[PDB]
Structure 1
Amino acid sequence: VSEIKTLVTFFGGTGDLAKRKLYPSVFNLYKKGYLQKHFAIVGTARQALNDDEFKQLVRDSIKDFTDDQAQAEAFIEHFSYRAHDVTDAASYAVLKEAIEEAADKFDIDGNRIFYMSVAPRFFGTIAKYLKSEGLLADTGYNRLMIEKPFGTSYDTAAELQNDLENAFDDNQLFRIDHYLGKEMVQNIAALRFGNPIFDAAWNKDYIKNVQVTLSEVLGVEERAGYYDTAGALLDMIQNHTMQIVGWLAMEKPESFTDKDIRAAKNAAFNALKIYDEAEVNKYFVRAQYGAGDSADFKPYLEELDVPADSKNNTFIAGELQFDLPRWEGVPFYVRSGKRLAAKQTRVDIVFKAGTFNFGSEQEACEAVLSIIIDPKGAIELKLNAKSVEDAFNTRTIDLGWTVSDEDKKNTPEPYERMIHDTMNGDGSNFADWNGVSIAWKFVDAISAVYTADKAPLETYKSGSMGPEASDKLLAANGDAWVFKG
């Protein structure tokens, strides 16, 4: 396999994410032979540790992924550390020095990746100092990996983007969204464009509606502190759901290059309808989970640290509309919520029923293409066939495929994939500025109605798939949620 020559700096190197997810992911790239001799990893945080102590931290982090002791040690030898406060400009001179020493020791010409595994408030600060204090390489590339979230409204995101653009171009920004790094999400484009029978049918003349579900069975848990201010709207819709929808609604690209894929996705995003107060009440539904059918399934307001006057949404369902010729009249239904009937991330594409008359009692129903992303990768195609009756009649049958154990074994973790894509300079599995800003504009419009309490807050029994208003939404267009639980 070909060698990747790169120098990666991990801000928040002693963090939980760094030791649980980042280091093991990088180790994997080394095991596969992508990282060989010309690469270095510089960790940093305020904690005063020397190179040996940091190496031991990394050693303990990759412990459970070690087979060959020699292999582990050869990898660990590529790490170095430097204590540093991100708010102290002068202190950046010390980190600059460590970076240059590492590049010398391992002979790396530029090719720097900066990973921000720190609190969101530091994002803009760090980027500006990388530029002003001279940490950016003058050779090769310079890429920034920004952890979530990327803003909390269009305004803040716009501000962050502005600060980031001081030192980087948008094509150098890699916003983390682990859902886009999921293997099955990447199968959408393959199924669509790789098969003419689907490619030709991916439009208003064959599709009736598209449904995206991101259900969870757990509740707010110990995360009340954050969740109460975010809700399903900011925690699941704005980011994960919107980006999955981007893959589904995109135009057919000129080629499969990241640049062309983004242009095709943006054509869709730019045609998305932004709702006013009236439209929000008509096309969206917000809810909060009530009691379950036992006692441990307590209502959201009775959860720990939840203000008894919280009107936070633990569920969102809504209809999206694209003003593009291929999607004219095709609603895109989305829904995500806590304490629902099942944990599942799926896409259901409902095809219009055919008008051929068999003269049978039961006529042709709608065919459905389902792509289950979580918990296990699956693809199902519900088609119309002949029923086993004496008289000719139709029925639906399901053609299915499931990921094999061998498949599961070879599938890279989402973080490995994302770091690897960044080293490659491949932006196809990453949201760009345009897609993110539009996602924010769309969501802000809804938020405004919610914080101003200009829309009802619904309730639903824990364990159900949501309030009846969710079904009322689809019924208005003669549609129904495919996944019932």
Structure 2
Amino acid sequence: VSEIKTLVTFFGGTGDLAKRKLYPSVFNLYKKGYLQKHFAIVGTARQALNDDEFKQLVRDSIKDFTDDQAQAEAFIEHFSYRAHDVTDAASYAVLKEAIEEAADKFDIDGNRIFYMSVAPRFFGTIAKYLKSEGLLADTGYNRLMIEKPFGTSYDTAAELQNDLENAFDDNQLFRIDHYLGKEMVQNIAALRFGNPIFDAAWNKDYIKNVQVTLSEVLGVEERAGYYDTAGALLDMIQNNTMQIVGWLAMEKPESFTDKDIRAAKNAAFNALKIYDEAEVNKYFVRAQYGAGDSADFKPYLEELDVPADSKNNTFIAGELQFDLPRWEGVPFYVRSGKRLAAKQTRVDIVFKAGTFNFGSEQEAQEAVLSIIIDPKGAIELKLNAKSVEDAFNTRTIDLGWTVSDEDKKNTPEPYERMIHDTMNGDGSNFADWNGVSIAWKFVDAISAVYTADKAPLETYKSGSMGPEASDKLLAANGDAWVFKG
């Protein structure tokens, strides 16, 4: 395995995410041998810790992932720490020093990765200071890993992008996308492009509609402070659903390189129809979860910290239209919500039914290619076969496949994947600015209608797949949801 020479700095190095996910992930890259000698990890935050105390912090962090004591300690030796205030410009000179000493001690020439595991409000400020205070490398690469969320509207995101471009280019920006870094999501291009029979049918001539579902069983729990301002539209649709749709709607790329993949995705994003008030009312649905069955499933307005006068959407369902010749007339239905029937992230490609008449009671029905992303990876294909009857008749059978236990064990952690791809300079599993800006332009149109109360707010029984308005949406084009719960 080839060695990766890099210097990673962790802003918010003492944070919960750093201990719980970040450090164990880079430890895995060490266990696999990607990180060997020529690497260093500088941690930073406000706390007044010295190197030994930080090393101890990393030690406790990777303790539940350690088999070999000597291997753990050899890794820990690559860490250092420097107390620093991100809002204090002068303070960056102290971090600059810790970085250069790390590069000298381990002989790293440039190749810097900056991780901002801090509050979103510091994101652009750090970026601008990395440039002005000269913490950027003059050799190799300079890559920035930005945590969620990337703005709360197109304006804020545009302002953020503007600040980041002061030190980096868009292709140096790696925005943490939890759903893009999923194994099954990465299987879509393989099934499509790797198999001529699907690749040739991935268009309007064979597909009736594409469905994307991100249902959850849980409610708002304690996250009401955040959720009441964001809702299903911002919390799930904007970032997680839009990017999955990006992999489904993309054109066929020139090659499988990140540049070509992004170009192919933007081809679809640039053809995405942005809606006005009338269309938002015609094509989208916003809902709030009402009473369930037992007293444990209380409505949204009775949840902890919910203002009672909240018109927050805990469910969203809508139709996306792309003005690309290959998707002309093919609706892309999306939906996501809290307190639904089952926890599941899936894509269902509904193929047009065949027009060959068998002369049977049951004629050929619509074939479906399902790709279950969460909780366990699975691929299913409901096809038309012959029924076991006396007279010739059709029926639909399901050919399926599920990930094996060996598959699950060999699957890299979401954060391991993301850190690794950044070190590689592979942006194929990351969204670019075009994809993110269009996603915001689309969602902003919808949000404008909602805050203005220019669209109805539906309700649904907790435990169902949403309100009937969601089914009304598909029935309008003669379609229906494949996953009924």
Bin the TM-score by the shorter chain.
over 0.9
CA distance in structure 2 between the aligned counterparts of 1:425 and 1:480, rounded to whole angstroms: 41
User: How far apart are the structure 2 equivalents of 1:465 and 1:124?
Assistant: 39
1:140 maps to 2:166 = no
After superposition, give the CA deviation of every residue in 1:212-241 in whole Å (9 maximum; x if it has no partner): 000000000000000000000000000000
Q: Deviations over 1:141-194 (max 9, x none)?
A: 000000000000000000000000000000000000111000000000000000
Q: Deviations over 1:417-449 (max 9, x none)?
A: 000000000000000000000000000000000
CA shift digits 1:291-331 (9 cap, x unpaired): 11100000000000000100000000000000000000000
> 1:66-122: per-residue Cα shift (whole Å, max 9, x none)?
000000000000000000000000000000000000000000000000000000000
Report the Cα offset of residue 415 of structure 1: 0.4
Q: Kindly, what percent of the aligned residue pairs are identical?
A: 100
Tell me the alpha carbon deviations over residues 363-410 of structure 1, each in whole angstroms, 9 at most, x when there is no partner: 000000000000000000000000000000000000000000000000
1:312 and 2:312 correspond: yes
Q: Tell me the residue number matched to 2:202.
A: 202
Task: Report the CA distance between 1:262 and its aligned residue.
Answer: 0.2
Alpha-carbon distance in 1 for matches of 2:293, 2:484: 18
Q: Give a deviation string over 1:341-365, Cα, whole Å, max 9, x none.
A: 0000000000000000000010000
SS in 1 for 2:395: strand
- Aligned partners of 2:124, 2:386: CA distance in 1, in Å? 61
Could you say what the CA RMSD is over the residues aligned between the two structures, in angstroms? 0.2
Question: How much does 1:269 deviate?
Answer: 0.1
Q: Distance in 2 between matches of 1:294 and 1:303?
A: 15
**SS of structure 2 residue aligned to 1:288:** strand
In the TM superposition, 1:377-388 aligns within 5 A as 377-388=377-388
Q: Deviations over 1:233-252 (max 9, x none)?
A: 00000000000000000000
CA–CA separation in structure 2 for the residues paired with 1:46 and 1:224? 28
Q: Secondary structure at the match of 1:186?
A: helix
1:25-66 residue CA offsets vs partner (Å, 9 max, x unmatched):
000000000000000000000000000000000000000000
Aligned equivalents of 1:399, 1:339: Cα separation in 2: 30
Any idea what SS the aligned residue of 2:349 has? strand
**1:451 offset after TM fit, Å?**
0.1
2:20 aligns with: 20
Separation in 2 of the partners of 1:405 and 1:180? 22
For 2:113 and 2:439, locate their aligned partners in 1 and report how far apart those are by CA, in whole Å. 26
2:37 and 2:175 map into 1 onto residues whose CA distance is: 28
Give distance in 2, aligned partners of 1:65 and 1:244: 31
Distance 2:176 2:118 in 1: 13
Q: Note the alpha carbon deviations across 1:247-297, whole angstroms, 9 max, x for none.
A: 000000000000000000000000000000000000000000001110000
- Show CA shifts across 1:447-482 (max 9, x none): 000000000000000000000000000000000000
Pairing 1:454–2:454 present = yes
Q: CA deviation at 1:8?
A: 0.0
CA distance in 1, matches of 2:280, 2:413: 37
Q: What is residue 131 of structure 1 aligned with on the other side?
A: 131
Corresponding residue number in structure 2 for 1:164? 164
Q: What is the distance in 2 between the residues matched to 1:299 and 1:175?
A: 34
So what's the TM-score if we normalise by structure 1?
1.00
Could you tell me which residue of structure 1 aligns to residue 423 of structure 2?
423
Query: 5+ residue gaps in structure 1?
Result: none
**In structure 1, how many angstroms separate the alpha carbons of the residues matched to 2:176 and 2:75?**
25
| Structure 2, unpaired ranges of 5+ | none
State the Cα distance separating 1:140 from its structure 2 match: 0.2
Cα distance in structure 1, aligned partners of 2:55 and 2:178? 27
* Separation in structure 2 between the aligned mates of residue 415 and residue 356 of structure 1, nearest angstrom: 49
Distance 1:45 1:332 in 2: 44
Residues 1:349 and 2:323 aligned together: no
Q: CA deviation at 1:20?
A: 0.2
C-alpha distance in structure 2 between counterparts of 1:453 and 1:308, whole Å = 16
1:328 correspondence with 2:366: no
Alignment: residue pair count: 485
Name 1:276's counterpart in structure 2: 276
Alignment of 1:384-423 (within 5 A): 384-423=384-423
Distance in 1 (CA, whole Å) between partners of 2:370 and 2:395 is 18
**Separation of aligned partners in 1, 2:308 and 2:259:** 48
Paired with 2:284 and 2:233, the residues of 1 have a C-alpha distance of 11
TM-score by length of 2: 1.00
Structure-2 separation of matches of 1:59 and 1:291: 46
